Amino acid sequence: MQFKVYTYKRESRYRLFVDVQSDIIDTPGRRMVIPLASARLLSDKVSRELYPVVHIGDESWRMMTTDMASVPVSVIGEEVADLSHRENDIKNAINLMFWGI
């Protein structure tokens, strides 16, 4: 479901992903998502508009907008959080990636 965050059942580069696909867009067995990388060692020079910083599990994460990809529902693990409250920054980052400023 859109803006919900889940873990991967099968190991991936990153450990969490936020579903960014519309809830009215039906793609049987799959969902478009954006991975979240730990912002623990990641550089601050990175555009926050394109790569929003979110907070889950008492830590900071970077939404890896440019690593967007679809995942089969078979790999969708437990839901760990809801990022719907960050819809504005998430929307802006996605739009920026395709259409610029």
Q: How far is the CB of 18 from a copy of itself (least distance, A)?
A: 12
| Between 57 and 66, CB nearer to a copy of itself | 66
Q: With CB cut-offs between 5 and 8 Å by kind, which of a copy of itself, Cl ion, none does residue 75 bind?
A: none
96 lies in the site for a copy of itself, by CB under 8 A: yes
Q: With CB cut-offs between 5 and 8 Å by kind, which of a copy of itself, Cl ion, none does residue 32 bind?
A: a copy of itself
Torsion (CA) 83, 88, 94, 97 in degrees, nearest 10 = -140
Q: With CB cut-offs between 5 and 8 Å by kind, which of Cl ion, a copy of itself, none does residue 33 bind?
A: none
Please give the angle made by the CA atoms of 91, 56 and 40, to the nearest 5 degrees: 95
Which residue do the tokens 């998430």 mark?
90
Taking the C-alpha atoms of residue 41 and residue 43, their distance in angstroms, rounded to an integer, is: 7
Site residues (CB under 8 A) for a copy of itself, limited to 36-95: 50, 66-70, 91, 94
* Contacts with 23 (C-beta within 8 Å, 6 or more apart), sequence order: 1, 2
